[PDB]
Structure formats: C-alpha cells, structure tokens
Amino acid sequence: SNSSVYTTFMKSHRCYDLIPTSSKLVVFDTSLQVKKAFFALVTNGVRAAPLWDSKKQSFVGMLTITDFINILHRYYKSALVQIYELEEHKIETWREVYLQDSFKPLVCISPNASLFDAVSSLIRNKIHRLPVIDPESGNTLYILTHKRILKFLKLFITEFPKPEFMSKSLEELQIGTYANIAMVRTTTPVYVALGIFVQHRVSALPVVDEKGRVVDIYSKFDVINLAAEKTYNNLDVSVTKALQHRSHYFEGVLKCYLHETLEAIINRLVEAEVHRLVVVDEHDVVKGIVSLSDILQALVLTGG
Amino acid sequence: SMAWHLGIRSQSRPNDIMAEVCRAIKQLDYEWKVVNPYYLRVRRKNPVTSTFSKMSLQLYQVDSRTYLLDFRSIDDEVAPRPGSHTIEFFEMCANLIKILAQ
Amino acid sequence: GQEMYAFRSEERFKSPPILPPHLLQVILNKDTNPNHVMLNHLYALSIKDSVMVLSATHRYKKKYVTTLLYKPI
Numbered sequence A: 001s002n003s004s005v006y007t008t009f010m011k012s013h014r015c016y017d018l019i020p021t022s023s024k025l026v027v028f029d030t031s032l033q034v035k036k037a038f039f040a041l042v043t044n045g046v047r048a049a050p051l052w053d054s055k056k057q058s059f060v061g062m063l064t065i066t067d068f069i070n071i072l073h074r075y076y077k078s079a080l081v082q083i084y085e086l087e088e089h090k091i092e093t094w095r096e097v098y099l100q101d102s103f104k105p106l107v108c109i110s111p112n113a114s115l116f117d118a119v120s121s122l123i124r125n126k127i128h129r130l131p132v133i134d135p136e137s138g139n140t141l142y143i144l145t146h147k148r149i150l151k152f153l154k155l156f157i158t159e160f161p162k163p164e165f166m167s168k169s170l171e172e173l174q175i176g177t178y179a180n181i182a183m184v185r186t187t188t189p190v191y192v193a194l195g196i197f198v199q200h201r202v203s204a205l206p207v208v209d210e211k212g213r214v215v216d217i218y219s220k221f222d223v224i225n226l227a228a229e230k231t232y233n234n235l236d237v238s239v240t241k242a243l244q245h246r247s248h249y250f251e252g253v254l255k256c257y258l259h260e261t262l263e264a265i266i267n268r269l270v271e272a273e274v275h276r277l278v279v280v281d282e283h284d285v286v287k288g289i290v291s292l293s294d295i296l297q298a299l300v301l302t303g304g
Numbered sequence B: 001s002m003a004w005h006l007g008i009r010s011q012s013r014p015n016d017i018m019a020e021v022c023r024a025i026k027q028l029d030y031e032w033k034v035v036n037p038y039y040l041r042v043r044r045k046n047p048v049t050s051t052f053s054k055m056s057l058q059l060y061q062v063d064s065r066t067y068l069l070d071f072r073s074i075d076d077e078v079a080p081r082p083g084s085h086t087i088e089f090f091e092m093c094a095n096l097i098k099i100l101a102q
Numbered sequence C: 001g002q003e004m005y006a007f008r009s010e011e012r013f014k015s016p017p018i019l020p021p022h023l024l025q026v027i028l029n030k031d032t033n034p035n036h037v038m039l040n041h042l043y044a045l046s047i048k049d050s051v052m053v054l055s056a057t058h059r060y061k062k063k064y065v066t067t068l069l070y071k072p073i
C-alpha cells in the first residue's frame, strides 16, 4: 500500500530528533589493547564504540560485538596452533590484519540529515551502528540503531491514516528470511556458535532441540559476557551453559507466525526491545527469522 | 567506571603547580593568558587539522594540604572529516598533564 | 618631590579558591542493574593497567553526551 506515511515521516525528520536528552559514548583510541577495549564495552554496558586515530586526528571506524566475535574466533583457532598474538594486539593491529586492501571506511550521518537517509545507510552498508556526527564540531553525538528507529516510528506515527500493507501478513509481504537459517543445538559449544556467527554474518542463532523446535536464542549480545571473564578458556562450554549468564529473567523465546500482520509484528518487536523474532510453525519448529533489518528495509521501500 | 574524579589532585605547592603548568604549556607551543594567579585560558592550533581549540585551567584548594587542577573546554565562538572538539579537549588535557605533572 | 608608597593587598590570592561553585570532586556512577553545570569539565577514573579514562559532558542544542575516552598512557 501507499507511498508511505512511513517514508514521508522519515524524510521529514532529522536524525537529531531521535537522540535522547542524555547519553553516554565510549570512544577508543586505536592504540588501545583489544582485550582492554572489549572489557570496557562490558564495563560501560555499551555494544559499540567509535575509533579515534590520534595520528590522523579523526574517527576511522567502529568496534562492535561483531568484531569481538571475529577476534575471539581467531584467538580460539590460533591457540590450537600455539599462536597467541591477538589478545595483546592493539585495535590498530587487528584492523590492519583484516581490513588490508579491503576498504571499509567509517560510515556516519549528520544530525541534520533525514531519518530516511539514516535507514538507507544502515541497509546499504549492512551495518547495525550508525554514529551521528556533528559536521561543525566533529563530535559524535549518538549511535543510531535499528531498534531505536523502529521504536521512534511506532511512537510518533498516528495509527489511523493506516497503510493497507500493515494489515497484510509476513507471508504475503515476503518480509523475513525463510531459508538457510543458521541455528545451534542445546549442547553446541560456544566456539562452534562463534564460527557460525563469523561465516553467516547474522545477529542471533536460534537454539533448537532434536526436533528442530526453538527452545532458546543465542544473540551476539550474549557473547560479550565472555569479555568479563579473565580467562577466555571457557569457550568449550555449551551455548545453554553460556546463557545462564544472561542476566534478567527469561520468558520463552519471542516468536511469531508467518501469518501475523506487519502491525502485530512491529508492535511485538517494539514492546520486547529485541532485534528479531523467530518465525515458527504451529509446533514451535523454526521456519525463519524476522529481523529489524527486514522490517526497516520493507518500510523504506514501502511494506513488501 | 564507578568513581569519577574532577581533574587531578596534588599536594604540591600551588606556586609550583602553576609554574609547572605554564612551563608545560610553553613546551607544547600552546598559547595562554593568565586571568588570575590560579586561572589560565589556553589555546592550541591542531598540527594535523589546523583548527584552534580553547580550554580553561583553574586551581582549587580542597583540603589544607590538597589542591585540585580543574580543566574545562571552551565552546567555539558520507565519511567524517578530521577533528572532534571533544576528543581534542581530552588530548590537550592528557598532553598538558603528561608534560607537567608526576 | 617625595618618594611614593605602594600598598599591596598581597593576599587576595594567598591560596587557590576553595572548591564548590558546586563542583563535586567525585561522581559515583553505578550500573544499578541533573547536576547543573559540571558541563565541559574533565573527569577521570583512577589510572588502571596503563589506561587513562577521560570523560566530559557536552551539549549539542538540547542534547547532552557524556563521552569517555579510553587511551593508553
């Protein structure tokens, strides 16, 4: 349906509008040891940090949980071959070790640029963290995420000039991923999950029983818990054992059916503050994933 | 990151604190003006970026034995360009501290 | 042509001013699970394992960001 109540809203609002009144921002100098950087993420309760290159006098990139996972996986394999470098690596040296010729410059956005431009930048760059950087100051103000954006959209858009597509199902809109779902089992070692994250470039893994029914969820976010330990040697534990550390409490995994409306799914995701739902059949067998990446890509091209 | 301290503390003589910070400022090629005996306004040209950044230094007494040097940034007046006023304020502070203290 | 005399208050600046224009020496921040204008002032953690952590809160229009820089010494 529609041009879009959504597309219009996004084009008429500045990135500034989604910034909270107060926030914190952790920045790492690129000469910081990698092990110290990751502990600092845990310590500060933060999932991403801009990288400042002191020689160049500029931000050059981000360090996120994805990078922690790439490093941990490399560390685990290298240790088996008695190569123990990475953990005394500084951020600089790890970045040089991967981003060799393969250019990945820092992607950012002005506080005065549109929300539509922000969403498009997240999708196009296949990224989850978009620093809002004031061109006048050069100051990073805030790190924009899919979660924040969908919440803002849900809150500030009236319900009842309502697009026809909102009452259509995930099935008919074809929103989500429905093949080659990367999953683990209860007993799957952490190091195996890490290799899966590294190969598939996916933000969470459903945990399934012998019958392929979802019983838990191992997010990349559940992985930085490991940075709190001084040892790192406990990567042979099961994913189930690793998730005992998931502080809070756990109801079930948050799921949906293929035949629920886009509206119902957006509402569920925003209330839960979670990056994806697991798409499941009548019997809890996993059929796919519907991520905030999927939803925002749809809303930016109009539902579909 | 539990306990945050405002600037840095010293039990050195305040006369020695100011003398040394002025020495470090001169050594780093920053410009400065003395507002009060315990209050300096400093300005630095960034070598890489060519921009100017300003901050204030203020010495306070906190005990009968203890002084506190307070640093405050002064406000001015798709891939990023070089520069961040906030990060540069941090570097200015760290540079001044390194080259005058302990 | 008499010699002239100088009267020197001497000690308006005997010692550095006493602290509070309510500037708090210490801010204690616990992740459990405003303060008017400590804006633009430098804060730091104790140096641990050869890393400085410098912090300050700055304003952009009506929004406030507290930036922490982790930097080796």
Ligand SMILES: Nc1ncnc2c1ncn2[C@@H]1O[C@H](COP(=O)(O)O)[C@@H](O)[C@H]1O
Pocket: A061, A062, A063, A064, A065, A066, A067, A104, A105, A106, A107, A108, A126, A127, A128, A129, A130, A131
């Ligand atoms: N805004 C950004 N600009 C450049 N690179 C980024 C940005 N955000 C994340 N990355 C990098 O892209 C990869 C995927 O990150 P993430 O989106 O956090 O899963 C990681 O290696 C990040 O370091």
Ligand SMILES: Nc1ncnc2c1ncn2[C@@H]1O[C@H](COP(=O)(O)O)[C@@H](O)[C@H]1O
Pocket: A176, A177, A179, A180, A181, A182, A183, A201, A202, A203, A204, A205, A206, A275, A276, A289, A290, A291, A292, A293, A294
């Ligand atoms: N575990 C997974 N297996 C397969 N595809 C996934 C998985 N998680 C997310 N996706 C898809 O990968 C894309 C990026 O999702 P995300 O990594 O959640 O931002 C979206 O199209 C998701 O539907």
Ligand SMILES: Nc1ncnc2c1ncn2[C@@H]1O[C@H](COP(=O)(O)O)[C@@H](O)[C@H]1O
Pocket: A203, A204, A217, A218, A219, A220, A221, A222, A246, A252, A253, A254, A255, A273, A274, A275, A276, A277, A278
């Ligand atoms: N569909 C879901 N059901 C239950 N918990 C989830 C789900 N998705 C993420 N989580 C948990 O919520 C936290 C945030 O993960 P993320 O949504 O990846 O930011 C992590 O502890 C996840 O394990």
